[PDB]
Design a protein around this ligand. Sequence first.
Ligand code: BEF
Ligand code: BEF
Ligand SMILES: [Mg+2]
Ligand SMILES: [Mg+2]
Lengths: 202, 208
Amino acid sequence: NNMNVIIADDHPIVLFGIRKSLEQIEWVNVVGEFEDSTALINNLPKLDAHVLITDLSMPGDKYGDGITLIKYIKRHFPSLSIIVLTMNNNPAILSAVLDLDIEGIVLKQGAPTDLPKALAALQKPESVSRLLEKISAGGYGDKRLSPKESEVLRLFAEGFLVTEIAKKLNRSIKTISSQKKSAMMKLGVENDIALLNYLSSV
Amino acid sequence: NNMNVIIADDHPIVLFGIRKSLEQIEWVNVVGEFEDSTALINNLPKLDAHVLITDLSMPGDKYGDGITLIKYIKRHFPSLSIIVLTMNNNPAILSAVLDLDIEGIVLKQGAPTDLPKALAALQKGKKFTPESVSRLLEKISAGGYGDKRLSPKESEVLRLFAEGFLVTEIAKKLNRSIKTISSQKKSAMMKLGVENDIALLNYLSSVT
DNA sequence: CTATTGAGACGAATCTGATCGG
DNA sequence: CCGATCAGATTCGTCTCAATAG
Ligand code: BEF
Ligand code: BEF
Ligand SMILES: [Mg+2]
Ligand SMILES: [Mg+2]
C-alpha cells in the first residue's frame, strides 16, 4: 500500500541522505523535509501524512524536542505513525523512549538498511524488540529512567541549564532538580561530571 | 581535473549521503568509507587519496576522537588535505580544531551546498568558512584580554573542575574564597568561547 | 590593563515535607 | 509504594561592584 512520510532532522545532509535512500522504494512518497519542531508542527496538518521520521536532538522554541515532542505529536496528531531516528546511544535515554509505544526506532549508528527494515514491518516492529533485549542483555536493566528523567538527562547533556529546562518544559526549577537528582540516584552517580561520564559512555 | 576522496563518519546514513553528494561532482572519486578512527588509519597508506572528509565525534579505541586524531593524521599522514564535517557547535572546540591547518571546516547543521562549496575551494585552492561556522567564531573573538591566554590560576581551576571536584571544595582546597574560584572559572570560560559548564568540559576532552 | 582577589546582592540549585495514582 | 509535582529554608554559585599591588 501507499504511505506519505515526513522527515524531521536538524542536519540537511542526513535529511537529503534519507530522501535519496527512499527514492529506491516506489510505494514510498516523501511529502516534506523540516529542520525544527516549529516547522514540523506548523505544516503537519496541511500535509496528509500516515508516518513521520524524526530525531531526538533538534531545535524547538515552542514544541520542544525528544520525549517532550513525541508525546505532543502523539497528542495533537494521533493519526500519524512516528519513527524515531537518534544519534544518541545512551541506554537510560533510550529506555524511556521505548515506552512511548511509537512505530519503531532506527539508530543513526546502525547499518543503513535498518530504516528500510523498519518501514517493511510497519506496512503490514522487530526494531523496537532488539534494543529492549540488547539494552537489558547488556547489563543496563538497572538503568530504567521515567520519561521526565530521560527528558532532562538528554537536555542536561545538550548543555541546557536546570533553570532553562524548567522554562522550556513548563515546570519549576525544583521539579526538574527532583527528576534530575532522582535520575543520578537510579544510575549510581553523585556529581554533574560523573553523570556526564555515564552519559558520554555506555 | 580529478582527485581521490575518503569519508569517515560513525553514522552510515551520513556516509550514504556524503558519497551520494559527491556523485554530483564528476571529477571527484570516492575511494573509502570508514566508521571508526582504527580502520581509517590502517587503510590510509593502502589508498592513494588527495583529500579526507571526516567527522570529529566518532568511536576510537587505539587512536583518539576529535582534535587528538586530527593532530595524529597531520603528523603521520601529512600530504593528505583534511576537511572536518562535524555536528559539533562549540566555538572553543571549532577554534582549537581550526588552528591545525585543515583545508576547510563544514558543519552538519550547515546548509547542504556547504560541502560542495568547501570542495569548490579545494578545486580553486582556498577555504570555505560558512555562515554557520562564522556565527560561532563571533563568541570567542573579543578585544585583546591577554590574547585569549589562560592565567596560571585559571588553568588550575578548569583542571580541578574537569577532575570532577566542585567549586566550593576548590575554594577550601586552593587557599582562598568561593568568589575567587567562581571568578577565575567564569573568567576562563569567556576567554575559550564557552558560556555553560557542559561546553567547558567537552573542550577539556578534545585537548587529551 | 590585567590579574588576583574579594564583599554584598541575587540567583541557581539541593534538601526536606507535603499533595494526589495505579 | 512511587510517580510527578511543588513550597518552604538553606546552601552553592554567580553577579554587581570594587580593592590590592604588579
Ligand atoms: F541528533 Be539525533 F539523535 F540523531
Ligand atoms: F557528531 Be559528529 F561530530 F558529527
Ligand atoms: Mg540531532
Ligand atoms: Mg559523530
